[PDB]
Amino acid sequence: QLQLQESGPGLVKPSETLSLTCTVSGGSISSSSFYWGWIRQPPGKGLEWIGSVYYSGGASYNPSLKSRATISVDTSKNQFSLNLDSVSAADTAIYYCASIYGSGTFYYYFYMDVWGKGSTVTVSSASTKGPSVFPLAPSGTAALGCLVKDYFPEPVTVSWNSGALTSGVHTFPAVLQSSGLYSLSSVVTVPSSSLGTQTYICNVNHKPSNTKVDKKVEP
């Protein structure tokens, strides 16, 4: 049924404007019982509602962000958007779109029903940088992996054999290096009898730099 998908840039430079678009599928945005909202989650903090829009175009905003925020809706393309002005590092966060179900006759009651998967927005002066991907090669159970080094901003996604290997995969949280760039590793454990026979490939995606890398990991 109803599905929401955010889209927009990954870096935005300080004092410039953040633009996100959420496309709704599995249902029309023009429903009388639904509102369309944006919620953000700064790193390691909680959730902050930004604002909501009704399919007629009426919007309601968080007071602390109303001056800079603008939420609009485009029924033709079945999508709604967020524009946030004069961004600073304080606006680095994951941005979720969500559907809000309203019901009631004498009073209008709300809950947030369906969420998008969130888009990571980083406010920075720096340029994007794509990672280098290196094999972590093995020596019962054997471990192998991929080292994903020196990228900016977050996030990268890693998968194995294009998703056919998920059992025992651990993709670690990224660490900030002294160089100011991120890196992580993704490892998997496999039967040591399969080495030299089976082929293992980690697929690394870093959208800000438009990097898609497949790396064979061999014993």
């Binding site: 909202g37 919620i39 909680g46 959730l47 902050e48 509602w49 909501s52 309601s60 968080n62 007071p63 979720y96 009073y107 009651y109 709300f110 809950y111 947030m112 029903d113 969420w115 998008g116 998967k117 969130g118 280098s132 290196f134 094999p135 972590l136 090669a137 093995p138 020596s139 159970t141 471990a143 992996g145 080292l147 080094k149 651990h170 670690f172 949280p173 990224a174 660490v175 290096q177 890196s183 992580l184 590793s185 490892v187 454990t189």
Partner: protein, 211 residues
């Protein structure tokens, strides 16, 4: 003045009854709702209008309360339930979320399996060497990883990362990466990581000889 949730975090055994509380900022008139955010995921609505379960939510979850004082309960905690739980109000025309309660699982001690990885040939050609040590599927999180290079203890050139708690067996995994220049890397022969952990009888060392 503001919403509260208590406790900010808790550790519970599998099968435990978990109870967390929420204080709205005023006496509520709109719905008071509860969301579950599992690590790396968007929040998910579990309970709406104080006590009503969304379709398909397991019966072990419930909510109750009135006025400003609300409760969320997990009657029998399961490994898949590790998450941060948020209450949510809508008052003065604003959605407000509570500060969140992080629920972790405590389980019995479990020993790590340890692996060590040399730098790849591709990376060396570029002038840097990353040596990686992996501690797989252990409990608790606390663990000591020491790098030794020709039996010399290292400091200031390694960084650690720890996974989120596993949603099936409630264990952790940990990586420690030692980073040297290719020049420094080639000045030494034996690279070893020594692991101390409550689940081990004595320290475990994994090593390799360069060359």
């Amino acid at each position: 003045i503001q919403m509260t949730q208590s406790p900010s975090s808790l550790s519970a055994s599998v099968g435990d009854r978990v109870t967390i509380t929420c204080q709205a900022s005023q006496v509520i008139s709109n719905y008071l709702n509860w969301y579950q955010q599992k690590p790396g995921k968007a929040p998910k609505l579990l309970i709406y209008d104080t006590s009503n379960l969304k379709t398909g939510v397991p019966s072990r979850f419930s909510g109750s309360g009135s006025g400003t004082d609300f409760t969320f309960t997990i009657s029998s905690l399961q490994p898949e339930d590790i998450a941060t739980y948020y209450c949510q109000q809508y008052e003065n025309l604003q959605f407000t979320f509570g500060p969140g309660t992080k629920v972790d699982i405590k389980r019995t001690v479990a020993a790590p399996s340890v692996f060590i990885f040399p730098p790849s040939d591709e990376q060396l050609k570029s002038g840097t060497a990353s040596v990686v040590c992996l501690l797989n599927n252990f409990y608790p999180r606390e663990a000591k990883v020491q790098w030794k290079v020709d039996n010399a203890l290292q400091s200031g050139n390694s960084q650690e990362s720890v996974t989120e708690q596993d949603s099936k067996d409630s264990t952790y995994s940990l990586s420690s990466t030692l980073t040297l220049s290719k020049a420094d890397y080639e000045k030494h022969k034996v690279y070893a990581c020594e692991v101390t952990h409550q689940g081990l009888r004595s320290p475990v060392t994994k090593s390799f000889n360069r060359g």
